[PDB]
Amino acid sequence: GAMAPSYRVKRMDIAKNDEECVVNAANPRGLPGDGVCKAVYKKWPESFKNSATPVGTAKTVMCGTYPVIHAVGPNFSNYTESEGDRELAAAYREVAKEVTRLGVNSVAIPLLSTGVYSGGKDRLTQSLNHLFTAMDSTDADVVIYCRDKEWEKKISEAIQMRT
Ligand SMILES: COc1ccc([C@@H](Cc2nnn[nH]2)NC(=O)c2ncnc3[nH]ccc23)cc1
Numbered sequence: 001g002a003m004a005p006s007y008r009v010k011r012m013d014i015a016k017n018d019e020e021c022v023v024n025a026a027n028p029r030g031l032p033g034d035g036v037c038k039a040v041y042k043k044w045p046e047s048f049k050n051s052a053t054p055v056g057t058a059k060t061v062m063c064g065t066y067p068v069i070h071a072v073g074p075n076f077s078n079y080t081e082s083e084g085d086r087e088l089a090a091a092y093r094e095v096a097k098e099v100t101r102l103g104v105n106s107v108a109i110p111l112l113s114t115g116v117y118s119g120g121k122d123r124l125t126q127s128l129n130h131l132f133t134a135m136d137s138t139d140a141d142v143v144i145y146c147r148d149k150e151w152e153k154k155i156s157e158a159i160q161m162r163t
Pocket residue numbers: 012013014015025035036039110111112113114115116117118145146147148151
């Protein structure tokens with residue numbers, strides 16, 4: 001694990017991360033998709049071999065020796081708020097189990113169920129809180145990747161508030 005486990009946020013493409021493994025915001029069918037998923041597909045295409053997995057789960061596939069954790073968050077256009085909240089929290093708990101199993105000292109993670117899976121709602125706080133609930137008991141350094149300037153500021157403030 002990391003010597004002093006921390007949370008950090010960076011506004012840049014997760015495909016250029018400087019961590020020991022990456023979490024993909026995957027679709028259940030293991031398709032190239034769009035957004036984070038498409039950037040992960042272009043960078044680590046080999047990691048999409050048998051990567052299909054249900055909503056609320058995570059499946060790791062190696063690209064060489066680099067682990068890609070395919071985490072499937074719910075699409076809030078299909079799920080109710082209550083059921084979608086439960087599956088989002090579960091996808092993050094499965095990410096924590098995988099990061100621990102892998103023995104990595106760091107992980108790059110995006111905010112699950114935001115963007116096209118958000119059902120047109122702002123889910124920054126909801127997704128980030130479920131991320132913290134799952135990752136707080138792990139000792140990996142966590143680096144959150146985002147693309148929006150206002151989101152970078154809000155994530156940074158949320159990290160600092162707890163320290
Ligand atoms: C439906 O799943 C999604 C998950 C995350 C996302 C969004 C959430 C977001 N939007 N503003 N800051 N954050 N993030 C990215 O699109 C993103 N983040 C990191 N690296 C990237 N490389 C290429 C894209 C990309 C959308 C959709």
